[PDB]
Structure 1
Amino acid sequence: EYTGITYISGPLLFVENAKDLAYGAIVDIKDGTGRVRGGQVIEVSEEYAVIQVFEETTGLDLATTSVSLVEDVARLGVSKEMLGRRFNGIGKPIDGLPPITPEKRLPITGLPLNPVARRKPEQFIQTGISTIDVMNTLVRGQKLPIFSGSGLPANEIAAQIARQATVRPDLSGEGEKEEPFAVVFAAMGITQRELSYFIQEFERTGALSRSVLFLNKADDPTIERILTPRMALTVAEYLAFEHDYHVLVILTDMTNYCEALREIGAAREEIPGRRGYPGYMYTDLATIYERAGVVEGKKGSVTQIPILSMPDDDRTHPIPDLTGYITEGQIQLSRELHRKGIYPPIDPLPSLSRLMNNGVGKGKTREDHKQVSDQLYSAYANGVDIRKLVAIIGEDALTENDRRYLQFADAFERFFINQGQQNRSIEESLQIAWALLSMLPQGELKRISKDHIGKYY
């Protein structure tokens, strides 16, 4: 215990000596204005240990202060009735109804994952927005960032896929007792618009019977934004591996993560500027995207599905750049088709799907799933390509081996990309994909050969 303080400050402050303060310990501080705070004890000194201030500088005095150790490190309960319930907020969750009993109290720091305790994917996620899960092949063995960008909404898209993920015994690879209707959402910081949007979405999706959504509530202090990710996570790591279930962490915008994070880096005098946003970013993120693999010797996983927007419709900013590097490849949506009406607009022109033939096969999804993967990609690609070089030399440059690739981009357009919010099975997608692969002469195709031609028309 330590009475007296010698620095009143907003992000970090002086606590004389130390002899039992752990790293990342929970302390309780009565401010003497009748208020109480906590924090982590990250950095411990026999000179001045500095403690994580959990709220603004106002409402502090030296008339009455005490620092008192509550626990060694951070810890919190994980109920087995956590699934099928929304637990908004953190510490004491205010989801506006009573909190669920902390049945197993374990650490919420993170539990690491051995790199030799991993195994190659074998699960597919059948989600109702065809276009992605066909070409990009949404599997749990990839963690591709979905980039919304400016004037493209991050919410609508995330909102969509919520109820629209479904489970089959073997059109999804694994079983439907190996995949529940449960999912987990972890906020990297929600904002005004982001919250005022998901209000209606809870009562419609079923955040009382199939979804867990930890939030920051958009109005809790900054340091909360570096707490909820990894807290949200660890919870799910338990019921996933040890209890056996597949859950997907559907993240939200990492912009507000940087936001909060940065203020610590200029009040400790670290490297908080890589190109205007932290140079220390990735170090803390090691843990988030470490469990986003596939376990070996247990069944069920955890996969981070980053969903993050960009401060500009150019990537000169560290926001999407440092994320690219960290993680693997990209999936995007852009605004090419959004200006015209298409919804959901999906442009995977500069995309990279790392895996697309692993975690699916033939008979794990469908036969022609493995073949029609790369096909659509370059068929469509070379559609948009024409419209480039026509206009360069007068207003035409097209051939008869162009008129077919041309219309393969119309055929892919409003027929396939546009769909409303209407659930589509992997069957309904690939089946009819082959009648749109009847706009170019079949038999000898770029990636397909005669082995699915005469079977799927």
Structure 2
Amino acid sequence: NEIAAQIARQATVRPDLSGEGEKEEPFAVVFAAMGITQRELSYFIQEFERTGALSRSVLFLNKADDPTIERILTPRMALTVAEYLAFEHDYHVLVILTDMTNYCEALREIGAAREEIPGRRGYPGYMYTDLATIYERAGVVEGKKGSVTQIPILSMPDDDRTHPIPDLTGYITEGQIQLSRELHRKGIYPPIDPLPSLSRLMNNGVGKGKTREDHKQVSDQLYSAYANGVDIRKLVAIIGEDALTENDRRYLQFADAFERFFINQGQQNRSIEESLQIAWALLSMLPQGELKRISKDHIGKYYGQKLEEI
């Protein structure tokens, strides 16, 4: 919930860094709640109110004690409003769905009421089709300026990625962001685990006229270095030896500093320039002896920062 609220507060178009520098096109956030309790509802209301984001938002809120059919109808209403705004008034709409787990539970209840054929864990056999009919309404239409972006937050039951809910959602959506319970145990916020995370549409949204020319290379190098650090530290618990090659100890330090500075950012609204700067500063590895998975010459332009913050 905190991540959803923070994204709703901080998400902005950033049109200046785009090639087509202009005044901001209208941006709105449609927030849909499904099976939400009073406490989380109060949290969301206060979070939207204290920052002025409530002005550019339409909230569809469905409490836990509401009829079980309102949970079914809430995402439909939210997406209908978002589609209308985007494709008839050029609004750039970001849609946040509070908990699709509650929606799937309500759908299971309705299906069991109708006595249909069950699925993997009692869910109706058409759950994929219904979730697709919700999710697929996002996108951009040729010849129109508006856009619809969806961030469905859902809870993995027992952190099981093979559960029907996350499985079908991943089958329908383009990538996913995964929260790590261990990173939460270490006090890191947001506890986003980059190794099991993926964005299918990332590769064509970064580059020249979009973010910065070093974005893709930096992301690839960060993934390579963090994976190397994670695998070294996972082997150390097996070998049980802190004594190893000198280069491995560089990555362990890099991995720890990464998890403590890049991922652990609290409530900071880091700009993409600031995030890239922090990535570059964390890039304390060898300019050539390391950082070789992606061949880039932006090293001579950006490398050499000394972990300085603010």
Deviations 1:396-450 (A, max 9, x none): 4631221121111022121211122111111111123222213333476233324
> Larger C-alpha radius of gyration, 1 or 2?
1
Q: Quick check: 1:431 aligned with 2:285? A: no
| Shift in alpha-carbon separation, 1:217–1:313, aligned structure 2, 3 A | closer
Aligned partner of residue 430 in structure 1, secondary structure:
helix
Segments of 4+ moved more than 6 angstroms: none
In the alignment of these two chains, the number of paired residues is 303
Aligned partner of residue 184 in structure 1, secondary structure:
strand
Match of 1:220 among 66, 69, 92: 66
Aligned 8 A contact 2:101 2:165 in 1: yes
| Superposed displacement of residue 204, structure 1 | 1.1
Query: How far apart, CA to CA, are the structure 2 residues paired with 1:432 and 1:254?
Result: 33
Aligned 8 A contact 1:443 1:449 in 2: no
| Superposed displacement of residue 353, structure 1 | 2.0
Query: How far apart, CA to CA, are the structure 2 residues paired with 1:410 and 1:176?
Result: 40
Instruction: State the match for 1:180 in structure 2.
Output: 26
| Shift in alpha-carbon separation, 1:217–1:202, aligned structure 2, 3 A | farther
Query: How far apart, CA to CA, are the structure 2 residues paired with 1:333 and 1:361?
Result: 27
Aligned 8 A contact 1:236 1:247 in 2: yes
Deviations 1:178-237 (A, max 9, x none): 543421112333234432422322321325412221111433211011111111111121
Query: How far apart, CA to CA, are the structure 2 residues paired with 1:176 and 1:211?
Result: 23
| Shift in alpha-carbon separation, 1:443–1:432, aligned structure 2, 3 A | farther
Deviations 1:339-380 (A, max 9, x none): 122122221222222122312222322121122121111111
| Shift in alpha-carbon separation, 1:301–1:193, aligned structure 2, 3 A | same
Query: How far apart, CA to CA, are the structure 1 residues paired with 2:39 and 2:118?
Result: 27
TM-score (norm 2): 0.89
Aligned partner of residue 205 in structure 1, secondary structure:
coil
Aligned partner of residue 392 in structure 1, secondary structure:
helix
Instruction: State the match for 1:389 in structure 2.
Output: 235
Aligned partner of residue 247 in structure 1, secondary structure:
strand
| Shift in alpha-carbon separation, 1:205–1:282, aligned structure 2, 3 A | farther
Aligned partner of residue 184 in structure 2, secondary structure:
coil
| Shift in alpha-carbon separation, 1:322–1:208, aligned structure 2, 3 A | closer
| Shift in alpha-carbon separation, 1:271–1:336, aligned structure 2, 3 A | same
| Shift in alpha-carbon separation, 1:429–1:346, aligned structure 2, 3 A | same
| Shift in alpha-carbon separation, 1:229–1:206, aligned structure 2, 3 A | same
Query: How far apart, CA to CA, are the structure 1 residues paired with 2:275 and 2:45?
Result: 31
Gaps of 5+ in 2: 304-310
Query: How far apart, CA to CA, are the structure 1 residues paired with 2:38 and 2:187?
Result: 25
Aligned partner of residue 43 in structure 2, secondary structure:
helix
Query: How far apart, CA to CA, are the structure 2 residues paired with 1:361 and 1:303?
Result: 20
TM-score (norm 1): 0.62
Query: How far apart, CA to CA, are the structure 2 residues paired with 1:347 and 1:173?
Result: 31
| Superposed displacement of residue 239, structure 1 | 1.9
Aligned 8 A contact 1:293 1:301 in 2: yes
| Shift in alpha-carbon separation, 1:230–1:177, aligned structure 2, 3 A | farther
Query: How far apart, CA to CA, are the structure 1 residues paired with 2:88 and 2:217?
Result: 36
Aligned 8 A contact 2:131 2:169 in 1: no
Query: How far apart, CA to CA, are the structure 2 residues paired with 1:186 and 1:368?
Result: 36
| Shift in alpha-carbon separation, 1:181–1:301, aligned structure 2, 3 A | closer
Aligned 8 A contact 1:391 1:397 in 2: no
How large is the RMSD of aligned CA atoms in angstroms? 2.2
| Shift in alpha-carbon separation, 1:333–1:440, aligned structure 2, 3 A | farther
Aligned partner of residue 132 in structure 2, secondary structure:
coil
State percent identity of aligned pairs. Answer: 100
Query: How far apart, CA to CA, are the structure 2 residues paired with 1:445 and 1:269?
Result: 57
Instruction: State the match for 1:356 in structure 2.
Output: 202
Between Structure 1 and Structure 2, the one with more strand by share is 1
Give the alignment of 1:49-448 within 5 angstroms: 155-171=1-17, 177=23, 179-396=25-242, 398-442=244-288, 445-448=291-294
Between 1 and 2, higher relative CO (CA 8 Å, sep ≥ 6) is seen in 1
Gaps of 5+ in 1: 1-154
